[PDB]
Every structure is written in C-alpha cells, then in structure tokens.
Design a protein around this motif. Sequence first.
Motif, PDB file in Angstrom:
ATOM      1  N   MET A   1      15.161 -27.360  37.343  1.00 26.53           N
ATOM      2  CA  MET A   1      14.787 -28.419  38.317  1.00 26.53           C
ATOM      3  C   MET A   1      13.497 -28.040  39.027  1.00 26.53           C
ATOM      4  O   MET A   1      13.333 -26.902  39.460  1.00 26.53           O
ATOM      5  CB  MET A   1      15.915 -28.638  39.322  1.00 26.53           C
ATOM      6  CG  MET A   1      15.568 -29.601  40.433  1.00 26.53           C
ATOM      7  SD  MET A   1      17.006 -30.424  41.131  1.00 26.53           S
ATOM      8  CE  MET A   1      18.119 -29.046  41.343  1.00 26.53           C
ATOM      9  N   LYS A   2      12.585 -29.000  39.143  1.00 21.26           N
ATOM     10  CA  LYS A   2      11.250 -28.745  39.656  1.00 21.26           C
ATOM     11  C   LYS A   2      11.170 -29.028  41.152  1.00 21.26           C
ATOM     12  O   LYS A   2      12.058 -29.640  41.755  1.00 21.26           O
ATOM     13  CB  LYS A   2      10.228 -29.593  38.906  1.00 21.26           C
ATOM     14  CG  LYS A   2      10.122 -29.278  37.419  1.00 21.26           C
ATOM     15  CD  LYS A   2       9.699 -27.842  37.139  1.00 21.26           C
ATOM     16  CE  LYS A   2       8.378 -27.500  37.803  1.00 21.26           C
ATOM     17  NZ  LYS A   2       7.821 -26.219  37.293  1.00 21.26           N
ATOM     18  N   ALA A   3      10.067 -28.581  41.751  1.00 24.58           N
ATOM     19  CA  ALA A   3       9.926 -28.671  43.198  1.00 24.58           C
ATOM     20  C   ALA A   3       9.895 -30.113  43.676  1.00 24.58           C
ATOM     21  O   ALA A   3      10.279 -30.388  44.813  1.00 24.58           O
ATOM     22  CB  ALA A   3       8.670 -27.937  43.652  1.00 24.58           C
ATOM     23  N   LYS A   4       9.453 -31.049  42.837  1.00 23.78           N
ATOM     24  CA  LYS A   4       9.436 -32.447  43.255  1.00 23.78           C
ATOM     25  C   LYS A   4      10.852 -32.976  43.472  1.00 23.78           C
ATOM     26  O   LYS A   4      11.154 -33.565  44.518  1.00 23.78           O
ATOM     27  CB  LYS A   4       8.693 -33.289  42.221  1.00 23.78           C
ATOM     28  CG  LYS A   4       8.685 -34.776  42.528  1.00 23.78           C
ATOM     29  CD  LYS A   4       7.644 -35.518  41.696  1.00 23.78           C
ATOM     30  CE  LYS A   4       7.805 -35.257  40.207  1.00 23.78           C
ATOM     31  NZ  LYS A   4       9.192 -35.522  39.735  1.00 23.78           N
ATOM     32  N   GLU A   5      11.742 -32.762  42.504  1.00 21.54           N
ATOM     33  CA  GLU A   5      13.134 -33.152  42.697  1.00 21.54           C
ATOM     34  C   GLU A   5      13.768 -32.371  43.839  1.00 21.54           C
ATOM     35  O   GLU A   5      14.569 -32.917  44.611  1.00 21.54           O
ATOM     36  CB  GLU A   5      13.921 -32.949  41.405  1.00 21.54           C
ATOM     37  CG  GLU A   5      13.389 -33.761  40.246  1.00 21.54           C
ATOM     38  CD  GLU A   5      12.398 -32.989  39.406  1.00 21.54           C
ATOM     39  OE1 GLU A   5      12.794 -31.967  38.809  1.00 21.54           O
ATOM     40  OE2 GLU A   5      11.221 -33.397  39.348  1.00 21.54           O
ATOM     41  N   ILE A   6      13.436 -31.088  43.960  1.00 22.14           N
ATOM     42  CA  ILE A   6      14.006 -30.305  45.050  1.00 22.14           C
ATOM     43  C   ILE A   6      13.604 -30.905  46.391  1.00 22.14           C
ATOM     44  O   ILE A   6      14.417 -30.991  47.315  1.00 22.14           O
ATOM     45  CB  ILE A   6      13.592 -28.829  44.928  1.00 22.14           C
ATOM     46  CG1 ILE A   6      14.133 -28.250  43.623  1.00 22.14           C
ATOM     47  CG2 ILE A   6      14.124 -28.033  46.107  1.00 22.14           C
ATOM     48  CD1 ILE A   6      13.627 -26.884  43.286  1.00 22.14           C
ATOM     49  N   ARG A   7      12.349 -31.335  46.517  1.00 22.49           N
ATOM     50  CA  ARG A   7      11.902 -31.955  47.758  1.00 22.49           C
ATOM     51  C   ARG A   7      12.544 -33.316  47.964  1.00 22.49           C
ATOM     52  O   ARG A   7      12.745 -33.736  49.107  1.00 22.49           O
ATOM     53  CB  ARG A   7      10.380 -32.075  47.769  1.00 22.49           C
ATOM     54  CG  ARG A   7       9.690 -30.739  47.893  1.00 22.49           C
ATOM     55  CD  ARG A   7       8.190 -30.843  47.950  1.00 22.49           C
ATOM     56  NE  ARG A   7       7.608 -29.515  48.112  1.00 22.49           N
ATOM     57  CZ  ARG A   7       6.998 -28.821  47.160  1.00 22.49           C
ATOM     58  NH1 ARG A   7       6.797 -29.319  45.952  1.00 22.49           N
ATOM     59  NH2 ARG A   7       6.586 -27.587  47.426  1.00 22.49           N
ATOM     60  N   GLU A  15      21.344 -26.667  49.784  1.00 19.43           N
ATOM     61  CA  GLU A  15      22.298 -25.568  49.897  1.00 19.43           C
ATOM     62  C   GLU A  15      23.364 -25.639  48.811  1.00 19.43           C
ATOM     63  O   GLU A  15      23.715 -24.618  48.206  1.00 19.43           O
ATOM     64  CB  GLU A  15      22.947 -25.571  51.277  1.00 19.43           C
ATOM     65  CG  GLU A  15      21.984 -25.312  52.411  1.00 19.43           C
ATOM     66  CD  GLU A  15      22.631 -25.495  53.766  1.00 19.43           C
ATOM     67  OE1 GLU A  15      23.877 -25.555  53.824  1.00 19.43           O
ATOM     68  OE2 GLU A  15      21.900 -25.574  54.775  1.00 19.43           O
ATOM     69  N   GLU A  16      23.895 -26.833  48.548  1.00 16.67           N
ATOM     70  CA  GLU A  16      24.916 -26.961  47.514  1.00 16.67           C
ATOM     71  C   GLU A  16      24.349 -26.619  46.147  1.00 16.67           C
ATOM     72  O   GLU A  16      25.026 -26.001  45.315  1.00 16.67           O
ATOM     73  CB  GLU A  16      25.494 -28.374  47.507  1.00 16.67           C
ATOM     74  CG  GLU A  16      26.169 -28.790  48.801  1.00 16.67           C
ATOM     75  CD  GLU A  16      27.112 -27.734  49.338  1.00 16.67           C
ATOM     76  OE1 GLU A  16      27.936 -27.219  48.553  1.00 16.67           O
ATOM     77  OE2 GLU A  16      27.026 -27.418  50.542  1.00 16.67           O
ATOM     78  N   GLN A  17      23.110 -27.029  45.887  1.00 17.16           N
ATOM     79  CA  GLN A  17      22.484 -26.704  44.618  1.00 17.16           C
ATOM     80  C   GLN A  17      22.277 -25.206  44.483  1.00 17.16           C
ATOM     81  O   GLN A  17      22.457 -24.648  43.398  1.00 17.16           O
ATOM     82  CB  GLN A  17      21.162 -27.450  44.490  1.00 17.16           C
ATOM     83  CG  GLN A  17      20.570 -27.388  43.106  1.00 17.16           C
ATOM     84  CD  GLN A  17      21.460 -28.021  42.069  1.00 17.16           C
ATOM     85  OE1 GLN A  17      21.765 -27.413  41.045  1.00 17.16           O
ATOM     86  NE2 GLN A  17      21.897 -29.245  42.332  1.00 17.16           N
ATOM     87  N   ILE A  18      21.896 -24.536  45.570  1.00 11.28           N
ATOM     88  CA  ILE A  18      21.759 -23.085  45.524  1.00 11.28           C
ATOM     89  C   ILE A  18      23.098 -22.444  45.196  1.00 11.28           C
ATOM     90  O   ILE A  18      23.174 -21.523  44.376  1.00 11.28           O
ATOM     91  CB  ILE A  18      21.182 -22.551  46.847  1.00 11.28           C
ATOM     92  CG1 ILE A  18      19.730 -22.995  47.015  1.00 11.28           C
ATOM     93  CG2 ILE A  18      21.259 -21.035  46.897  1.00 11.28           C
ATOM     94  CD1 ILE A  18      19.177 -22.763  48.397  1.00 11.28           C
ATOM     95  N   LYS A  19      24.173 -22.911  45.831  1.00 12.13           N
ATOM     96  CA  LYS A  19      25.488 -22.342  45.547  1.00 12.13           C
ATOM     97  C   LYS A  19      25.854 -22.511  44.080  1.00 12.13           C
ATOM     98  O   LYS A  19      26.276 -21.555  43.416  1.00 12.13           O
ATOM     99  CB  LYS A  19      26.554 -22.986  46.430  1.00 12.13           C
ATOM    100  CG  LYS A  19      26.525 -22.530  47.864  1.00 12.13           C
ATOM    101  CD  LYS A  19      27.716 -23.069  48.635  1.00 12.13           C
ATOM    102  CE  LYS A  19      27.740 -22.538  50.058  1.00 12.13           C
ATOM    103  NZ  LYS A  19      26.501 -22.884  50.809  1.00 12.13           N
ATOM    104  N   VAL A  46      17.631 -20.457  35.443  1.00 10.65           N
ATOM    105  CA  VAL A  46      18.416 -20.627  36.660  1.00 10.65           C
ATOM    106  C   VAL A  46      17.838 -19.792  37.794  1.00 10.65           C
ATOM    107  O   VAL A  46      17.832 -20.222  38.950  1.00 10.65           O
ATOM    108  CB  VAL A  46      19.893 -20.278  36.398  1.00 10.65           C
ATOM    109  CG1 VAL A  46      20.702 -20.410  37.667  1.00 10.65           C
ATOM    110  CG2 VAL A  46      20.475 -21.182  35.335  1.00 10.65           C
ATOM    111  N   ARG A  47      17.377 -18.576  37.494  1.00  5.73           N
ATOM    112  CA  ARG A  47      16.800 -17.733  38.534  1.00  5.73           C
ATOM    113  C   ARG A  47      15.602 -18.412  39.181  1.00  5.73           C
ATOM    114  O   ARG A  47      15.463 -18.415  40.411  1.00  5.73           O
ATOM    115  CB  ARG A  47      16.405 -16.380  37.947  1.00  5.73           C
ATOM    116  CG  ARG A  47      17.585 -15.501  37.615  1.00  5.73           C
ATOM    117  CD  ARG A  47      17.171 -14.204  36.951  1.00  5.73           C
ATOM    118  NE  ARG A  47      16.841 -13.155  37.908  1.00  5.73           N
ATOM    119  CZ  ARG A  47      15.676 -12.528  37.993  1.00  5.73           C
ATOM    120  NH1 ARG A  47      14.661 -12.832  37.202  1.00  5.73           N
ATOM    121  NH2 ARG A  47      15.527 -11.567  38.897  1.00  5.73           N
ATOM    122  N   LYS A  48      14.726 -18.997  38.366  1.00  5.82           N
ATOM    123  CA  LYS A  48      13.574 -19.696  38.919  1.00  5.82           C
ATOM    124  C   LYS A  48      13.987 -20.963  39.657  1.00  5.82           C
ATOM    125  O   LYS A  48      13.350 -21.333  40.648  1.00  5.82           O
ATOM    126  CB  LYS A  48      12.580 -20.014  37.807  1.00  5.82           C
ATOM    127  CG  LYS A  48      12.083 -18.790  37.069  1.00  5.82           C
ATOM    128  CD  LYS A  48      11.194 -17.925  37.936  1.00  5.82           C
ATOM    129  CE  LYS A  48      11.076 -16.514  37.390  1.00  5.82           C
ATOM    130  NZ  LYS A  48      12.309 -15.726  37.604  1.00  5.82           N
TER     131      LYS A  48
END
Length: 65
Positions: A1-7, A15-19, A46-48
């Motif tokens: 998942m890229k920074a655009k979707e993350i934003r 937080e849920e995605q990080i978990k 996944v690490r990135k």
Amino acid sequence: MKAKEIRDLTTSEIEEQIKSSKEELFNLRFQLATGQLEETARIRTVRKTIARLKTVAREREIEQS
RNA sequence: UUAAGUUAUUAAGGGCGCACGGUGGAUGCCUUGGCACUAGAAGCCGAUGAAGGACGUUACUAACGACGAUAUGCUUUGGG
C-alpha cells in the motif's frame, strides 16, 4: 500500500492497518522459520508498508502540533 | 711359442661446454593508491545528547559499506 492510500486512510484506520500488517509479518516470519514460505518478497513488502503507515502517522501528529 | 718393450680400453663418480626443464620473483610495461602544490570555498560539533564505538537490520548473511526496531531503509519536492 502506497503513501497516497495511506493518507486517504484515517488515523484509527492507520493504527488498525499497522496492527494487521505486523500480524501478517509475524506469520510470514513463522512460515519462513518452519520452511513453508516460498514467496519471500512478501516480508519486505509488508515491512515497507508498515514503515509507510508509521511515516504518515508521524506526519499527521507533527502537523497537528 | 717365449722374452723384452710400448700403448689402450674402463667412469663408480667428477670436470668443462651444450640442450631441455624446475624453482624463484628480479626486470620491462601498467595503475586502482600515494607525494608536493595552485585557485576558490569553508574553518567547528555537543544536554534538542557530540566525536567515537557496541549491537543489530537482507530470502539465504561470516565480512566491508549503507542503514537503525519505520533498520540492506520511509515521505516529499525536483532531475533522469
């Protein structure tokens, strides 16, 4: 998942995605240890993803201040 | 046949010369690294935790580099 979707995601969603990503990474490492992981590139992917999620979260909690 | 006399051949090994090899790393050529300087810039870093280290991070990871549990890297803006 890229920074655009993350934003696009919201803080709770970040937080849920990080978990869930950390749980996936753990499962991948356990498969690798037991010899059941052929698709080893998933670990780095996944690490990135986790790194990007935390980066965006930090950007938000910085720009709030 | 006898007598008297003379002189070879031998190379176990060695010597000189020659041929062919080995070892060794000189010489010639070469340069990735040095040496001496010129011009311009710059002439400090640190409790907002430095210099320097230890330990880690990769699919496999002993070592050097890079990086720091966001780890063999993350975001963004430009280049290509």
